Write a protein that holds these residues in place. Sequence first.
Motif: not given
Lengths: 123, 132, 125, 127
Positions: A90, A92-93, A98, A100, A102, A117, A119, C76, C112, C115
Amino acid sequence: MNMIDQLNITDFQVFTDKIYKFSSKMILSDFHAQPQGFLNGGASLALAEITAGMASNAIGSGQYFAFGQSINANHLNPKKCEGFVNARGLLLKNGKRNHVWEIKITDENETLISQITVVNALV
Amino acid sequence: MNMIDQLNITDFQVFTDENSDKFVSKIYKFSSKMILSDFHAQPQGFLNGGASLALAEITAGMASNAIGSGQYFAFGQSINANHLNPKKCEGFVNARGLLLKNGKRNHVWEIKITDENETLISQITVVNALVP
Amino acid sequence: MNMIDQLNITDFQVFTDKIYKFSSKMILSDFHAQPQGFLNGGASLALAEITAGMASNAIGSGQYFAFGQSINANHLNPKKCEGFVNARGLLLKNGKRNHVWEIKITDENETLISQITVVNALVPQ
Amino acid sequence: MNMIDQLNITDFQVFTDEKIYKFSSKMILSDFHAQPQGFLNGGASLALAEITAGMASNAIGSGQYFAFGQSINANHLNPKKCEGFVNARGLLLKNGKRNHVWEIKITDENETLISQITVVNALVPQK
Protein backbone atom coordinates in the motif's frame (compact mmCIF):
# COMPACT_ATOMS: atom_id res chain seq x y z
CA MET A 1 21.12 -15.70 -13.27
CA ASN A 2 20.79 -12.92 -10.70
CA MET A 3 19.12 -12.71 -7.27
CA ILE A 4 15.95 -10.93 -8.41
CA ASP A 5 15.19 -13.70 -10.94
CA GLN A 6 16.00 -16.63 -8.62
CA LEU A 7 13.67 -15.15 -5.97
CA ASN A 8 10.95 -16.16 -8.46
CA ILE A 9 8.50 -13.27 -7.99
CA THR A 10 5.26 -14.06 -9.84
CA ASP A 11 1.89 -12.45 -10.66
CA PHE A 12 3.12 -8.92 -9.91
CA GLN A 13 0.35 -6.35 -10.38
CA VAL A 14 0.21 -2.65 -9.51
CA PHE A 15 -3.31 -1.23 -9.29
CA THR A 16 -5.39 1.67 -7.98
CA ASP A 17 -8.04 0.26 -5.64
CA LYS A 18 -5.87 7.84 -5.63
CA ILE A 19 -4.74 4.84 -3.56
CA TYR A 20 -1.94 2.91 -5.26
CA LYS A 21 -1.51 -0.75 -4.30
CA PHE A 22 0.50 -3.77 -5.43
CA SER A 23 0.36 -7.54 -4.96
CA SER A 24 2.71 -10.41 -5.86
CA LYS A 25 3.67 -13.99 -5.07
CA MET A 26 7.04 -15.53 -4.29
CA ILE A 27 7.36 -19.25 -5.01
CA LEU A 28 9.64 -20.82 -2.40
CA SER A 29 12.44 -23.32 -3.10
CA ASP A 30 15.70 -24.34 -1.36
CA PHE A 31 17.12 -21.02 -2.61
CA HIS A 32 15.01 -19.19 0.02
CA ALA A 33 15.84 -21.44 3.00
CA GLN A 34 18.03 -20.57 5.97
CA PRO A 35 19.87 -23.40 7.84
CA GLN A 36 17.02 -24.29 10.27
CA GLY A 37 14.53 -24.99 7.43
CA PHE A 38 12.55 -21.73 7.55
CA LEU A 39 12.16 -18.95 4.97
CA ASN A 40 15.20 -16.66 5.14
CA GLY A 41 14.35 -13.15 6.32
CA GLY A 42 16.82 -11.76 3.77
CA ALA A 43 14.69 -13.23 0.98
CA SER A 44 11.61 -11.43 2.40
CA LEU A 45 13.48 -8.11 2.64
CA ALA A 46 14.67 -8.49 -0.95
CA LEU A 47 11.12 -9.25 -2.11
CA ALA A 48 9.84 -6.07 -0.45
CA GLU A 49 12.58 -3.72 -1.75
CA ILE A 50 12.29 -5.10 -5.31
CA THR A 51 8.49 -5.15 -5.65
CA ALA A 52 8.36 -1.66 -4.07
CA GLY A 53 10.89 -0.48 -6.68
CA MET A 54 8.92 -2.14 -9.48
CA ALA A 55 5.65 -0.63 -8.22
CA SER A 56 7.05 2.91 -7.92
CA ASN A 57 8.53 2.78 -11.45
CA ALA A 58 5.22 1.61 -12.95
CA ILE A 59 3.47 4.65 -11.43
CA GLY A 60 6.12 6.99 -12.89
CA SER A 61 5.79 5.62 -16.48
CA GLY A 62 9.22 6.79 -17.74
CA GLN A 63 9.57 9.93 -15.56
CA TYR A 64 11.86 8.47 -12.83
CA PHE A 65 13.68 5.40 -11.49
CA ALA A 66 13.02 4.14 -7.95
CA PHE A 67 15.97 3.70 -5.60
CA GLY A 68 15.53 2.20 -2.12
CA GLN A 69 16.47 4.77 0.53
CA SER A 70 15.39 3.15 3.76
CA ILE A 71 13.68 -0.07 4.79
CA ASN A 72 12.24 -1.34 8.06
CA ALA A 73 11.02 -4.87 8.74
CA ASN A 74 9.57 -6.87 11.61
CA HIS A 75 9.64 -10.66 11.23
CA LEU A 76 6.51 -11.69 13.09
CA ASN A 77 5.91 -15.39 12.40
CA PRO A 78 8.21 -18.14 11.07
CA LYS A 79 7.34 -19.57 7.67
CA LYS A 80 8.56 -23.06 6.80
CA CYS A 81 10.34 -22.78 3.45
CA GLU A 82 7.69 -24.36 1.22
CA GLY A 83 4.87 -23.28 -1.12
CA PHE A 84 4.56 -19.50 -1.47
CA VAL A 85 4.17 -16.14 0.24
CA ASN A 86 2.19 -13.07 -0.85
CA ALA A 87 3.74 -9.59 -0.78
CA ARG A 88 0.99 -6.96 -0.75
CA GLY A 89 1.78 -3.24 -0.79
CA LEU A 90 0.00 0.00 0.00
CA LEU A 91 1.38 3.41 -0.98
CA LEU A 92 1.26 5.60 2.14
CA LYS A 93 2.80 8.70 0.54
CA ASN A 94 2.83 9.61 -3.14
CA GLY A 95 5.38 12.43 -2.87
CA LYS A 96 7.47 14.38 -5.37
CA ARG A 97 10.82 13.12 -4.04
CA ASN A 98 9.75 9.92 -2.22
CA HIS A 99 7.37 6.97 -2.18
CA VAL A 100 6.52 5.24 1.11
CA TRP A 101 5.26 1.67 0.79
CA GLU A 102 3.63 -0.32 3.58
CA ILE A 103 4.20 -4.00 2.68
CA LYS A 104 2.66 -7.12 4.21
CA ILE A 105 4.18 -10.57 3.66
CA THR A 106 1.59 -13.30 4.25
CA ASP A 107 1.58 -17.09 3.82
CA GLU A 108 -1.16 -19.19 2.13
CA ASN A 109 -3.32 -19.00 5.29
CA GLU A 110 -2.95 -15.16 5.28
CA THR A 111 -0.86 -15.33 8.46
CA LEU A 112 1.31 -12.20 8.64
CA ILE A 113 4.93 -13.37 8.28
CA SER A 114 6.58 -9.94 7.90
CA GLN A 115 5.52 -6.30 7.90
CA ILE A 116 7.90 -4.09 5.91
CA THR A 117 8.10 -0.35 5.14
CA VAL A 118 10.14 0.79 2.14
CA VAL A 119 10.99 4.40 1.36
CA ASN A 120 11.98 4.82 -2.30
CA ALA A 121 13.94 7.81 -3.59
CA LEU A 122 12.59 9.17 -6.86
CA VAL A 123 15.53 10.06 -9.16
CA MET B 1 23.53 -23.11 -4.15
CA ASN B 2 20.95 -21.30 -2.01
CA MET B 3 20.74 -17.50 -1.71
CA ILE B 4 23.05 -17.44 1.33
CA ASP B 5 25.90 -19.20 -0.51
CA GLN B 6 25.37 -17.26 -3.75
CA LEU B 7 25.79 -14.01 -1.78
CA ASN B 8 29.49 -14.98 -1.54
CA ILE B 9 30.11 -13.85 2.05
CA THR B 10 33.87 -14.03 2.71
CA ASP B 11 36.36 -13.47 5.57
CA PHE B 12 33.74 -13.86 8.34
CA GLN B 13 35.15 -13.38 11.85
CA VAL B 14 33.57 -12.56 15.21
CA PHE B 15 35.82 -11.17 17.97
CA THR B 16 36.20 -9.14 21.16
CA ASP B 17 38.56 -6.21 21.73
CA GLU B 18 41.64 -6.81 23.89
CA ASN B 19 40.39 -3.97 26.12
CA SER B 20 37.21 -5.86 27.13
CA ASP B 21 39.45 -8.56 28.66
CA LYS B 22 39.14 -7.73 32.39
CA PHE B 23 35.64 -6.13 32.16
CA VAL B 24 32.25 -7.85 32.83
CA SER B 25 30.52 -6.43 29.73
CA LYS B 26 32.47 -7.79 26.74
CA ILE B 27 32.41 -5.76 23.52
CA TYR B 28 31.58 -8.06 20.60
CA LYS B 29 32.26 -7.22 16.97
CA PHE B 30 32.18 -9.00 13.62
CA SER B 31 33.86 -8.47 10.24
CA SER B 32 33.15 -9.81 6.75
CA LYS B 33 33.27 -9.09 3.03
CA MET B 34 30.81 -9.74 0.23
CA ILE B 35 32.28 -10.27 -3.23
CA LEU B 36 30.00 -8.75 -5.89
CA SER B 37 28.86 -10.08 -9.26
CA ASP B 38 25.75 -9.51 -11.42
CA PHE B 39 23.90 -11.66 -8.88
CA HIS B 40 23.93 -8.64 -6.56
CA ALA B 41 22.91 -6.05 -9.19
CA GLN B 42 19.77 -3.93 -9.46
CA PRO B 43 18.39 -2.62 -12.84
CA GLN B 44 20.72 0.44 -13.04
CA GLY B 45 23.97 -1.47 -12.34
CA PHE B 46 24.33 -0.58 -8.65
CA LEU B 47 24.48 -2.90 -5.64
CA ASN B 48 20.94 -4.05 -4.86
CA GLY B 49 19.77 -3.04 -1.37
CA GLY B 50 18.16 -6.44 -0.89
CA ALA B 51 21.63 -8.03 -1.10
CA SER B 52 22.99 -5.64 1.57
CA LEU B 53 19.94 -6.25 3.78
CA ALA B 54 20.41 -10.00 3.42
CA LEU B 55 24.16 -9.65 4.12
CA ALA B 56 23.37 -7.79 7.36
CA GLU B 57 20.74 -10.25 8.62
CA ILE B 58 22.89 -13.28 7.72
CA THR B 59 26.18 -12.04 9.25
CA ALA B 60 24.40 -10.82 12.40
CA GLY B 61 22.85 -14.29 12.75
CA MET B 62 26.23 -15.96 12.22
CA ALA B 63 27.88 -13.66 14.79
CA SER B 64 25.11 -14.20 17.37
CA ASN B 65 25.31 -18.00 16.96
CA ALA B 66 29.12 -17.94 17.33
CA ILE B 67 28.84 -15.90 20.57
CA GLY B 68 26.22 -18.27 22.03
CA SER B 69 27.76 -21.53 20.78
CA GLY B 70 25.14 -24.21 21.51
CA GLN B 71 23.54 -22.12 24.27
CA TYR B 72 21.07 -20.60 21.80
CA PHE B 73 20.23 -20.10 18.13
CA ALA B 74 19.57 -16.66 16.66
CA PHE B 75 16.60 -15.70 14.49
CA GLY B 76 16.08 -12.37 12.71
CA GLN B 77 13.33 -10.45 14.50
CA SER B 78 13.91 -6.89 13.30
CA ILE B 79 15.91 -5.01 10.71
CA ASN B 80 16.22 -1.30 9.90
CA ALA B 81 18.39 0.03 7.08
CA ASN B 82 19.30 3.40 5.67
CA HIS B 83 20.99 3.36 2.25
CA LEU B 84 23.33 6.36 2.28
CA ASN B 85 25.52 6.10 -0.82
CA PRO B 86 25.26 4.20 -4.11
CA LYS B 87 27.64 1.31 -4.73
CA LYS B 88 28.40 0.27 -8.31
CA CYS B 89 27.95 -3.50 -8.43
CA GLU B 90 31.62 -4.55 -8.71
CA GLY B 91 34.53 -5.45 -6.41
CA PHE B 92 33.40 -5.97 -2.80
CA VAL B 93 31.80 -4.42 0.28
CA ASN B 94 32.61 -4.80 3.99
CA ALA B 95 30.02 -5.60 6.64
CA ARG B 96 31.18 -4.80 10.17
CA GLY B 97 29.08 -5.24 13.28
CA LEU B 98 29.08 -3.95 16.83
CA LEU B 99 26.93 -5.66 19.45
CA LEU B 100 25.04 -2.84 21.18
CA LYS B 101 23.11 -5.17 23.46
CA ASN B 102 23.89 -8.66 24.69
CA GLY B 103 20.48 -9.35 26.20
CA LYS B 104 19.08 -12.60 27.56
CA ARG B 105 16.49 -12.91 24.76
CA ASN B 106 17.74 -10.40 22.13
CA HIS B 107 20.98 -9.36 20.42
CA VAL B 108 21.05 -5.87 18.92
CA TRP B 109 23.74 -5.36 16.26
CA GLU B 110 24.88 -2.08 14.76
CA ILE B 111 26.15 -2.89 11.26
CA LYS B 112 27.99 -0.63 8.83
CA ILE B 113 28.20 -1.60 5.17
CA THR B 114 31.16 0.08 3.58
CA ASP B 115 32.88 0.01 0.17
CA GLU B 116 36.55 -0.84 -0.48
CA ASN B 117 37.44 2.82 0.22
CA GLU B 118 35.64 2.74 3.61
CA THR B 119 32.83 4.99 2.32
CA LEU B 120 29.60 4.23 4.23
CA ILE B 121 27.11 2.63 1.83
CA SER B 122 24.41 1.45 4.25
CA GLN B 123 23.84 1.69 8.00
CA ILE B 124 21.82 -1.24 9.36
CA THR B 125 20.53 -2.33 12.76
CA VAL B 126 19.53 -5.96 13.31
CA VAL B 127 17.65 -7.35 16.29
CA ASN B 128 17.98 -11.13 16.70
CA ALA B 129 15.73 -13.32 18.83
CA LEU B 130 17.65 -15.82 20.97
CA VAL B 131 16.15 -19.33 21.04
CA PRO B 132 17.04 -21.97 23.73
CA MET C 1 1.46 17.21 35.05
CA ASN C 2 4.00 15.03 33.31
CA MET C 3 4.57 14.69 29.56
CA ILE C 4 1.85 12.04 29.21
CA ASP C 5 -0.79 14.31 30.81
CA GLN C 6 0.26 17.39 28.81
CA LEU C 7 0.28 15.47 25.51
CA ASN C 8 -3.52 15.48 26.07
CA ILE C 9 -4.53 12.02 24.85
CA THR C 10 -8.31 11.63 24.91
CA ASP C 11 -10.92 9.01 23.94
CA PHE C 12 -8.51 6.10 24.32
CA GLN C 13 -10.20 2.73 23.89
CA VAL C 14 -8.97 -0.73 22.97
CA PHE C 15 -11.43 -2.94 21.11
CA THR C 16 -11.39 -6.49 19.74
CA ASP C 17 -12.62 -7.94 16.44
CA LYS C 18 -8.48 -12.12 18.51
CA ILE C 19 -7.68 -8.95 16.57
CA TYR C 20 -6.80 -6.14 18.98
CA LYS C 21 -7.19 -2.52 17.85
CA PHE C 22 -7.11 0.89 19.53
CA SER C 23 -8.21 4.44 18.76
CA SER C 24 -7.49 7.75 20.51
CA LYS C 25 -7.17 11.49 19.95
CA MET C 26 -4.40 13.91 20.71
CA ILE C 27 -5.61 17.44 21.33
CA LEU C 28 -3.13 19.98 20.00
CA SER C 29 -2.10 23.28 21.56
CA ASP C 30 1.09 25.35 22.08
CA PHE C 31 2.55 22.43 24.06
CA HIS C 32 2.89 20.33 20.86
CA ALA C 33 4.34 23.02 18.55
CA GLN C 34 7.75 23.12 16.85
CA PRO C 35 9.27 26.54 15.95
CA GLN C 36 7.78 26.88 12.43
CA GLY C 37 4.21 26.31 13.70
CA PHE C 38 3.84 22.62 12.83
CA LEU C 39 3.01 19.68 15.06
CA ASN C 40 6.35 18.58 16.50
CA GLY C 41 7.20 15.13 15.10
CA GLY C 42 8.59 14.32 18.54
CA ALA C 43 5.09 14.75 19.97
CA SER C 44 3.77 12.20 17.46
CA LEU C 45 6.59 9.75 18.22
CA ALA C 46 5.72 10.09 21.93
CA LEU C 47 2.00 9.69 21.21
CA ALA C 48 2.72 6.42 19.37
CA GLU C 49 4.96 4.88 22.06
CA ILE C 50 2.62 5.89 24.91
CA THR C 51 -0.65 4.72 23.25
CA ALA C 52 0.95 1.42 22.17
CA GLY C 53 2.07 1.00 25.80
CA MET C 54 -1.41 1.97 27.04
CA ALA C 55 -3.02 -0.54 24.69
CA SER C 56 -0.70 -3.40 25.67
CA ASN C 57 -1.29 -2.69 29.38
CA ALA C 58 -5.06 -2.88 28.82
CA ILE C 59 -4.60 -6.31 27.21
CA GLY C 60 -2.29 -7.48 30.03
CA SER C 61 -4.91 -7.07 32.77
CA GLY C 62 -2.23 -6.35 35.40
CA GLN C 63 -0.12 -9.44 34.62
CA TYR C 64 2.60 -7.35 32.96
CA PHE C 65 3.48 -3.77 32.01
CA ALA C 66 4.57 -2.73 28.52
CA PHE C 67 8.00 -1.22 27.96
CA GLY C 68 8.78 0.33 24.56
CA GLN C 69 11.53 -1.69 22.86
CA SER C 70 11.79 -0.46 19.27
CA ILE C 71 9.95 2.21 17.32
CA ASN C 72 9.96 2.96 13.61
CA ALA C 73 8.30 6.10 12.28
CA ASN C 74 7.77 7.78 8.96
CA HIS C 75 6.53 11.37 9.05
CA LEU C 76 4.54 11.60 5.86
CA ASN C 77 2.66 14.90 5.76
CA PRO C 78 2.78 18.27 7.58
CA LYS C 79 0.22 19.07 10.27
CA LYS C 80 -0.32 22.57 11.63
CA CYS C 81 -0.37 22.72 15.42
CA GLU C 82 -4.14 23.19 15.79
CA GLY C 83 -7.24 21.03 16.31
CA PHE C 84 -6.41 17.34 16.77
CA VAL C 85 -4.95 14.16 15.32
CA ASN C 86 -6.22 10.59 15.61
CA ALA C 87 -3.98 7.74 16.72
CA ARG C 88 -5.27 4.34 15.66
CA GLY C 89 -3.41 1.09 16.25
CA LEU C 90 -3.58 -2.52 15.11
CA LEU C 91 -1.85 -5.40 16.92
CA LEU C 92 0.22 -7.16 14.26
CA LYS C 93 1.64 -9.65 16.75
CA ASN C 94 0.13 -10.79 20.05
CA GLY C 95 3.25 -12.55 21.41
CA LYS C 96 3.94 -13.80 24.94
CA ARG C 97 6.81 -11.38 25.61
CA ASN C 98 6.30 -8.87 22.76
CA HIS C 99 3.48 -6.92 21.15
CA VAL C 100 3.92 -5.32 17.73
CA TRP C 101 1.64 -2.33 17.07
CA GLU C 102 0.96 -0.74 13.69
CA ILE C 103 -0.06 2.86 14.44
CA LYS C 104 -1.51 5.33 11.95
CA ILE C 105 -1.67 9.02 12.92
CA THR C 106 -4.17 10.99 10.81
CA ASP C 107 -5.58 14.52 10.86
CA GLU C 108 -9.31 15.37 11.02
CA ASN C 109 -9.51 14.89 7.22
CA GLU C 110 -8.05 11.37 7.67
CA THR C 111 -4.92 12.56 5.85
CA LEU C 112 -2.09 10.30 7.05
CA ILE C 113 0.39 12.41 9.03
CA SER C 114 2.75 9.73 10.39
CA GLN C 115 2.96 5.95 10.36
CA ILE C 116 4.64 4.26 13.28
CA THR C 117 5.38 0.69 14.28
CA VAL C 118 6.03 0.01 17.97
CA VAL C 119 7.37 -3.18 19.56
CA ASN C 120 6.62 -3.46 23.29
CA ALA C 121 8.44 -5.78 25.67
CA LEU C 122 6.01 -7.43 28.08
CA VAL C 123 7.60 -7.48 31.55
CA PRO C 124 5.95 -9.52 34.39
CA GLN C 125 4.42 -7.47 37.21
CA MET D 1 6.04 26.17 28.52
CA ASN D 2 5.84 23.89 25.50
CA MET D 3 7.17 20.34 25.17
CA ILE D 4 10.62 21.31 23.86
CA ASP D 5 11.30 23.58 26.87
CA GLN D 6 9.84 21.18 29.46
CA LEU D 7 12.08 18.41 28.07
CA ASN D 8 14.91 20.57 29.48
CA ILE D 9 17.60 20.00 26.85
CA THR D 10 20.89 21.61 27.94
CA ASP D 11 24.56 21.89 26.90
CA PHE D 12 23.65 21.64 23.21
CA GLN D 13 26.51 22.09 20.74
CA VAL D 14 27.38 21.13 17.17
CA PHE D 15 31.01 20.58 16.14
CA THR D 16 33.31 18.92 13.60
CA ASP D 17 35.79 16.07 14.15
CA GLU D 18 38.48 13.83 12.57
CA LYS D 19 34.70 16.93 7.74
CA ILE D 20 32.61 14.86 10.14
CA TYR D 21 29.70 16.61 11.86
CA LYS D 22 28.71 15.69 15.42
CA PHE D 23 26.48 17.07 18.15
CA SER D 24 26.47 16.79 21.94
CA SER D 25 23.69 17.51 24.46
CA LYS D 26 22.09 16.67 27.80
CA MET D 27 18.54 16.13 28.97
CA ILE D 28 17.96 16.61 32.70
CA LEU D 29 15.16 14.45 34.08
CA SER D 30 12.19 15.22 36.32
CA ASP D 31 8.92 13.31 36.72
CA PHE D 32 7.77 15.15 33.56
CA HIS D 33 9.86 12.53 31.72
CA ALA D 34 8.52 9.53 33.68
CA GLN D 35 6.25 6.68 32.59
CA PRO D 36 3.92 4.91 35.14
CA GLN D 37 6.55 2.49 36.56
CA GLY D 38 9.06 5.26 37.35
CA PHE D 39 11.29 4.78 34.31
CA LEU D 40 12.30 7.34 31.71
CA ASN D 41 9.54 7.52 29.11
CA GLY D 42 10.82 6.20 25.77
CA GLY D 43 8.70 8.92 24.13
CA ALA D 44 10.84 11.59 25.80
CA SER D 45 13.98 9.98 24.32
CA LEU D 46 12.36 9.79 20.88
CA ALA D 47 11.49 13.50 21.10
CA LEU D 48 14.99 14.35 22.38
CA ALA D 49 16.46 12.63 19.30
CA GLU D 50 14.13 14.34 16.77
CA ILE D 51 14.56 17.78 18.38
CA THR D 52 18.37 17.67 18.70
CA ALA D 53 18.76 16.18 15.19
CA GLY D 54 16.60 19.05 13.88
CA MET D 55 18.53 21.67 15.86
CA ALA D 56 21.87 20.28 14.67
CA SER D 57 20.80 20.16 11.00
CA ASN D 58 19.53 23.76 11.23
CA ALA D 59 22.81 24.89 12.81
CA ILE D 60 24.59 23.51 9.71
CA GLY D 61 22.12 24.96 7.19
CA SER D 62 21.72 28.39 8.76
CA GLY D 63 19.54 29.24 7.17
CA GLN D 64 19.33 27.82 3.64
CA TYR D 65 16.89 25.07 4.71
CA PHE D 66 14.64 23.96 7.57
CA ALA D 67 15.17 20.49 9.01
CA PHE D 68 12.09 18.29 9.27
CA GLY D 69 12.13 14.77 10.69
CA GLN D 70 11.24 12.36 7.91
CA SER D 71 11.92 8.96 9.44
CA ILE D 72 13.12 7.86 12.87
CA ASN D 73 14.22 4.45 14.10
CA ALA D 74 14.78 3.67 17.78
CA ASN D 75 15.93 0.71 19.81
CA HIS D 76 15.47 1.17 23.56
CA LEU D 77 18.19 -1.11 24.92
CA ASN D 78 18.24 -0.48 28.65
CA PRO D 79 15.65 0.96 31.02
CA LYS D 80 16.59 4.05 33.00
CA LYS D 81 15.11 5.25 36.28
CA CYS D 82 13.63 8.71 35.77
CA GLU D 83 16.28 10.67 37.68
CA GLY D 84 19.48 12.63 36.96
CA PHE D 85 20.29 13.12 33.28
CA VAL D 86 20.94 11.44 29.93
CA ASN D 87 23.45 12.36 27.20
CA ALA D 88 22.38 12.61 23.56
CA ARG D 89 25.25 12.53 21.06
CA GLY D 90 24.72 12.55 17.30
CA LEU D 91 26.92 11.64 14.35
CA LEU D 92 26.15 12.81 10.81
CA LEU D 93 26.31 9.67 8.67
CA LYS D 94 25.20 11.42 5.48
CA ASN D 95 25.44 15.10 4.63
CA GLY D 96 23.13 15.10 1.61
CA LYS D 97 21.85 18.09 -0.35
CA ARG D 98 18.27 16.93 0.34
CA ASN D 99 18.61 14.71 3.43
CA HIS D 100 20.63 14.37 6.64
CA VAL D 101 20.98 11.05 8.44
CA TRP D 102 21.93 11.33 12.13
CA GLU D 103 23.02 8.37 14.25
CA ILE D 104 22.16 9.32 17.84
CA LYS D 105 23.28 7.66 21.07
CA ILE D 106 21.37 8.23 24.31
CA THR D 107 23.50 7.19 27.29
CA ASP D 108 23.26 7.64 31.06
CA GLU D 109 25.56 9.47 33.51
CA ASN D 110 28.15 6.69 33.14
CA GLU D 111 27.81 6.37 29.34
CA THR D 112 25.77 3.17 29.41
CA LEU D 113 23.79 3.09 26.16
CA ILE D 114 20.08 3.56 26.96
CA SER D 115 18.76 4.04 23.39
CA GLN D 116 20.18 4.13 19.90
CA ILE D 117 18.17 6.26 17.48
CA THR D 118 18.62 7.16 13.80
CA VAL D 119 16.96 10.32 12.48
CA VAL D 120 16.56 11.09 8.78
CA ASN D 121 15.85 14.81 8.24
CA ALA D 122 14.31 16.29 5.12
CA LEU D 123 16.16 19.43 3.99
CA VAL D 124 13.62 21.90 2.58
CA PRO D 125 14.49 25.45 1.34
CA GLN D 126 13.22 28.44 3.34
CA LYS D 127 12.67 29.56 0.66
